[PDB]
Amino acid sequence: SGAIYVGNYRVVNRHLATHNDWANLVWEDSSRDLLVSSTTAQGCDTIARCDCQTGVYYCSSRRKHYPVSFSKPSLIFVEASEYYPARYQSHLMLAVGHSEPGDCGGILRCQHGVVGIVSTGGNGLVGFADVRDLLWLDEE
Ligand SMILES: [Zn+2]
């Protein structure tokens, strides 16, 4: 589990979105595993605006933050998980690292801020749903 809180926005994995998230929907995209809902309170996370390929992610299943290299956001074929079939996921970045289903929502961060959240795992790879292209999170 985990979210990003920027401005009046809450960013979560679409497959973990709550009723309250859907009842306050701003934007969602199944192909990215993302959903954004509106918040009453201001959040304090900063979204990275960059093309970094190194950062640190939180892995809840090891109680650890791991420094990783990660790939460019791309359309990647992902094996079946407990929450999606095998499919193409868009705007996904991979690193070599541990990722359980419960690790979804863990933050990947670089020097510029939050890059994205854990979305995929297996075969010794962790996949992150990029948010750096969602420039509208910075405004309105
Ligand atoms: Zn960066």
Which experiment gave this structure? X-ray
Give distance in angstroms: CA of 53 to centre of ligand 1.
8
Give distance in angstroms: CA of 134 to centre of ligand 1.
14
91: annotated active-site residue: no
Q: What is the resolution of this structure in A?
A: 1.3
33: annotated active-site residue: yes
Please spell the DSSP secondary structure of 70-126, one letter per residue: -PPSEEEEE---SSS-SEEEEEEEEEES---GGGTTPEEEETTEEEEEEEEEETTEE
Contacts of 136 (CB under 8 A, 6+ apart): none
Q: Which SS3 state, helix, strand or coil, does residue 131 take?
A: coil
59: annotated active-site residue: no
Three-state SS letters, 14-78: HHHCCHHHHHCEEEEEHHHCEEEEEEEEEEECCECCCCCCEEEEEEHHHCEEEEEECCCCEEEEE
